[PDB]
Design an enzyme around this catalytic site. Structure first.
Site, PDB file in Angstrom:
ATOM      1  CD  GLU A 201      -2.856  -1.310   2.234  1.00  0.00           C
ATOM      2  OE1 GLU A 201      -3.173  -0.378   2.995  1.00  0.00           O
ATOM      3  OE2 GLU A 201      -3.142  -2.502   2.458  1.00  0.00           O
TER       4      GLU A 201
ATOM      5  NE  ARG B  64      -4.885  -1.819  -1.505  1.00  0.00           N
ATOM      6  CZ  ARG B  64      -3.652  -2.255  -1.715  1.00  0.00           C
ATOM      7  NH1 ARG B  64      -2.724  -1.443  -2.222  1.00  0.00           N
ATOM      8  NH2 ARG B  64      -3.367  -3.518  -1.441  1.00  0.00           N
TER       9      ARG B  64
ATOM     10  CB  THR C 284      -1.372   5.495  -6.786  1.00  0.00           C
ATOM     11  OG1 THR C 284      -2.373   4.788  -6.046  1.00  0.00           O
ATOM     12  CG2 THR C 284      -1.909   6.876  -7.106  1.00  0.00           C
TER      13      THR C 284
ATOM     14  CG  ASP D 110       2.729  -2.097 -10.431  1.00  0.00           C
ATOM     15  OD1 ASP D 110       1.489  -2.023 -10.575  1.00  0.00           O
ATOM     16  OD2 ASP D 110       3.331  -1.559  -9.480  1.00  0.00           O
TER      17      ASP D 110
ATOM     18  CD  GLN E 210       0.326  -6.524  -0.108  1.00  0.00           C
ATOM     19  OE1 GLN E 210       0.170  -6.977  -1.225  1.00  0.00           O
ATOM     20  NE2 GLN E 210       0.216  -5.243   0.149  1.00  0.00           N
TER      21      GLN E 210
HETATM   22  N1  LIG Z   1      -4.511  10.315  -0.192  1.00  0.00           N
HETATM   23  C1  LIG Z   1      -3.605   9.587  -0.845  1.00  0.00           C
HETATM   24  N2  LIG Z   1      -3.675   8.404  -1.254  1.00  0.00           N
HETATM   25  C2  LIG Z   1      -2.627   7.844  -1.898  1.00  0.00           C
HETATM   26  C3  LIG Z   1      -1.326   8.423  -2.234  1.00  0.00           C
HETATM   27  N3  LIG Z   1      -0.657   7.438  -2.871  1.00  0.00           N
HETATM   28  C4  LIG Z   1      -1.296   6.136  -3.080  1.00  0.00           C
HETATM   29  N4  LIG Z   1      -2.592   6.590  -2.372  1.00  0.00           N
HETATM   30  C5  LIG Z   1      -3.765   5.675  -2.204  1.00  0.00           C
HETATM   31  O1  LIG Z   1      -3.368   4.585  -1.219  1.00  0.00           O
HETATM   32  C6  LIG Z   1      -3.879   3.174  -1.631  1.00  0.00           C
HETATM   33  C7  LIG Z   1      -2.641   2.448  -1.965  1.00  0.00           C
HETATM   34  O2  LIG Z   1      -1.857   2.981  -3.173  1.00  0.00           O
HETATM   35  P1  LIG Z   1      -1.686   1.799  -4.231  1.00  0.00           P
HETATM   36  O3  LIG Z   1      -1.145   2.209  -5.667  1.00  0.00           O
HETATM   37  O4  LIG Z   1      -2.793   0.665  -4.194  1.00  0.00           O
HETATM   38  O5  LIG Z   1      -0.253   1.167  -3.576  1.00  0.00           O
HETATM   39  P2  LIG Z   1       0.327  -0.257  -4.063  1.00  0.00           P
HETATM   40  O6  LIG Z   1       0.035  -0.837  -2.495  1.00  0.00           O
HETATM   41  O7  LIG Z   1       1.839  -0.351  -4.348  1.00  0.00           O
HETATM   42  O8  LIG Z   1      -0.659  -0.723  -5.055  1.00  0.00           O
HETATM   43  C8  LIG Z   1      -4.758   3.554  -2.912  1.00  0.00           C
HETATM   44  O9  LIG Z   1      -6.107   3.920  -2.287  1.00  0.00           O
HETATM   45  C9  LIG Z   1      -4.130   4.867  -3.497  1.00  0.00           C
HETATM   46  O10 LIG Z   1      -4.881   5.686  -4.393  1.00  0.00           O
HETATM   47  C10 LIG Z   1      -1.288   9.761  -1.752  1.00  0.00           C
HETATM   48  O11 LIG Z   1      -0.114  10.443  -1.991  1.00  0.00           O
HETATM   49  N5  LIG Z   1      -2.337  10.397  -1.077  1.00  0.00           N
HETATM   50  F1  ALF Z   2      -0.847  -3.455  -1.818  1.00  0.00           F
HETATM   51 AL1  ALF Z   2       0.197  -3.224  -3.250  1.00  0.00          AL
HETATM   52  F2  ALF Z   2       1.242  -3.027  -4.697  1.00  0.00           F
HETATM   53  F3  ALF Z   2      -1.252  -3.274  -4.318  1.00  0.00           F
HETATM   54  F4  ALF Z   2       1.649  -3.221  -2.208  1.00  0.00           F
HETATM   55 MG   LIG Z   3      -0.178  -2.254  -6.365  1.00  0.00          MG
END
Ligand SMILES: Nc1nc2c(ncn2[C@@H]2O[C@H](COP(=O)(O)OP(=O)(O)O)[C@@H](O)[C@H]2O)c(=O)[nH]1
Ligand code: ALF
Ligand SMILES: [Mg+2]
Lengths: 305, 119
Positions: free
Chosen positions: A9, A141, A14, A160, A164
């Site tokens: 996360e 998300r 994003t 990408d 986890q």
């Molecule tokens: N408010 C906010 N949300 C963010 C930011 N960056 C990622 N998010 C949100 O946090 C959640 C996780 O980002 P995501 O791309 O799923 O991270 P990933 O865990 O690598 O996929 C999603 O709801 C995103 O839109 C930010 O700078 N501000």
């Molecule tokens: F929870 Al992610 F990339 F979607 F770390």
């Molecule tokens: Mg992701």
């Protein structure tokens, strides 16, 4: 070759949606569902945590419309447009003082990052004509599994991954010849715990993660760029949530500049070979300019090689 | 044949599954489906001991920390499975399988459709 690596996360994905805005209707038609879920869900989360924390409802008459939501999550019918009685049950609920009280304690449980943003648009998205905003698609998300590769050329390969712990064993693959690596880090995580074990401090995991990724042999002659993402969430909380909740040691004062300075020093110290340099950047994956501006700068560090 | 583009149709297609799998295998997350097809067979066992046996094997292959084909579930899901393992019942891996389905469905599935593999 670019690796968009990071903990769970942290926004590694994003950030990729900004490499896109730099979304045909076919796609925007696809996020309509997603945005439905993220909303109903986030509301669901606060409903449940209401019990787990012992947070009395501001109005008993909410237990009704409340449970009416959990059934939706349950019935799985939460990927489909809010039935009239729902868009209201949620709006009315999102408007109870209890919900708010328990929402403000959202650091004590796991609640969607975009929880606020979406719930502050229950009406906006609950329109029969609704079409997903440039942002709505970003604030979404969806836990990424495996390695997803996308291509594109800017100023004359993207990877990408899953953040986890159970995904990290698969990383070792695309580890061959990595030009540069953008490492995402949720500033907001300093006082939260991993999804995988309700124990480990998210911030801490990032540091142990980066430390591993940073001093890996495969990347001796590789550009390591660090994105201290979610700087916006970080700012609105740092004032009411001590950074010491992460670093007992932290002697500074709880202010955006102070805590950011420290949080920035901790990561940079996890670097070994003195013959190397790292690049910090207070990013915010959900703000195209910022990503745009920063990615530019990055392209340089890379092309500057 | 084509209905695939419901998700569970893909799953109940001896042809569909085998197909999807090839996709995931490149995308690096075929364990999600393997664990899923696994829990599916697991369900067909009646023998209490044979169940405990496989329950333990599935655990060590998919759930176990740092397991080989370790799936991506959360803390609450894992402990729960861990507790269920304490008395191999057919409903053991249900939740785990549950959450896994979703992960595939809402994530790797779409990116799967819109791609060579499904054309
Ligand atoms: N408010 C906010 N949300 C963010 C930011 N960056 C990622 N998010 C949100 O946090 C959640 C996780 O980002 P995501 O791309 O799923 O991270 P990933 O865990 O690598 O996929 C999603 O709801 C995103 O839109 C930010 O700078 N501000
Ligand atoms: F929870 Al992610 F990339 F979607 F770390
Ligand atoms: Mg992701």
């Amino acid at each position: 070759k670019l690796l968009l690596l990071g903990a769970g996360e942290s926004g590694k994905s994003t950030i990729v949606k900004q490499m896109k805005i730099i979304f045909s209707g076919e796609d925007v038609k696809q996020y309509k569902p997603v945005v439905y879920s993220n909303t109903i869900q986030s509301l669901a989360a606060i409903v449940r945590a209401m019990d787990t924390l012992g947070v009395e409802y501001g109005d008993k008459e909410r237990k009704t419309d409340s449970k009416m939501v959990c059934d939706v999550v349950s019935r799985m019918e939460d990927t489909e447009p809010f039935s009239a009685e729902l868009l209201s049950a949620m709006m009315r609920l999102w408007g109870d003082s209890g919900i708010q009280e328990c929402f403000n304690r959202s650091r004590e449980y796991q609640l969607n990052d975009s929880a606020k943003y979406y719930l502050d648009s229950l009406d906006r998205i609950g329109a029969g004509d609704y079409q997903p905003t440039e942002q709505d698609i970003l604030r979404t998300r969806v836990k990424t599994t495996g390695i997803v590769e996308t291509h594109f050329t800017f100023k004359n390969r993207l990877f990408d991954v899953g953040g986890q712990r159970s995904e990290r064993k698969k990383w070792i693959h695309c580890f061959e010849d990595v030009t540069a690596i953008i490492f995402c880090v949720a500033l907001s995580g300093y006082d939260q715990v991993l999804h995988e074990d309700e124990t480990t401090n998210r911030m801490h995991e990032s540091l142990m993660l980066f430390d591993s990724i940073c001093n890996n042999k495969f990347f001796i002659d590789t550009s390591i760029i660090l994105f201290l993402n979610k700087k916006d969430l970080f700012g609105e909380k740092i004032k009411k949530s001590p950074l010491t909740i992460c670093f007992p040691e932290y002697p500074g004062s709880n202010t955006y500049e102070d805590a950011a300075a420290y949080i920035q020093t901790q990561f940079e110290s996890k670097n070994r070979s003195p013959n190397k340099e790292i690049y910090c950047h207070m990013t915010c994956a959900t703000d195209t300019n910022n990503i745009q501006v920063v990615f530019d700068a990055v392209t340089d560090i890379i092309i500057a090689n | 044949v084509l209905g695939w583009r419901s998700f569970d149709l893909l799953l109940n297609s001896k042809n569909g599954v085998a197909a999807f799998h090839a996709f995931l295998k490149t995308e690096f997350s075929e364990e999600n489906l393997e664990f899923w097809l696994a829990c599916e067979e697991f369900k067909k066992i009646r023998s209490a001991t044979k169940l405990a046996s496989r329950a333990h094997h599935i655990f060590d292959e998919y759930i176990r920390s740092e397991a080989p084909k370790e799936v991506n579930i959360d803390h609450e899901t894992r402990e729960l499975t861990k507790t269920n393992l304490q008395a191999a019942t057919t409903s053991c891996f249900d939740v785990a399988q549950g959450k896994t389905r979703t992960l595939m469905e809402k994530d790797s599935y779409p990116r799967f459709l819109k791609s060579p593999a499904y054309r």
